[PDB]
Design a binder for this molecule. Structure first.
Ligand code: HEC
Length: 121
């Protein structure tokens, strides 16, 4: 049972690279642009943010699984350890990505925070 209040704090480990900004430009969490905006990520098609330059592996996940979206379960796994998640979904041990950051605790909490800011999932 993820706690979005705890997740908001844990998101300080994500905001160097990611923002959470609503479609009207309102910052929920002011953050970087190295990774894509995470507002609305829960239920969002994998690797589908307009203009973002994704790595080959995550694009392959989306290409080979056209109906795939970010579920809460997949988010928890990916946040925990991104690379093996990509290997799992692509079936390719050499799946690319420069994104290896692993969150070691409170993963369901951060995902609850992301879900709070995906009001239309
Ligand atoms: C920079 C060093 C990052 C940190 C710290 C975190 N993320 Fe990240 N994220 C980053 C990049 C460059 C990418 C693109 C990956 C690729 O291979 O192209 C991502 C992607 C995500 C995604 C997928 C988004 C999508 O639109 O499909 C998610 C859900 C995500 N990142 C979440 C996330 C969280 C919760 C983090 C803190 C725990 C976090 N990331 C850290 C770069 C960086």
């Amino acid at each position: 049972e993820g706690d979005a209040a705890k997740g908001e704090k844990e998101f300080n480990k994500c905001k160097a690279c990611h923002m959470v900004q609503a479609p009207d430009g309102t910052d929920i969490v002011k953050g970087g642009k190295t990774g894509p905006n995470l507002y609305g990520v829960v239920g969002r098609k994998i690797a589908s943010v307009e203009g973002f330059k994704y790595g080959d592996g995550i694009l392959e996940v989306a290409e080979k699984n056209p109906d795939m979206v970010w579920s809460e379960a997949d988010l928890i796994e990916y946040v925990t350890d991104p690379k093996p998640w990509l290997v799992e979904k692509t079936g390719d041990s050499a799946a690319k990505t420069k994104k290896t950051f692993k969150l070691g605790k409170n993963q369901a909490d951060v995902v609850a925070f992301l879900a709070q800011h995906s009001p239309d999932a």
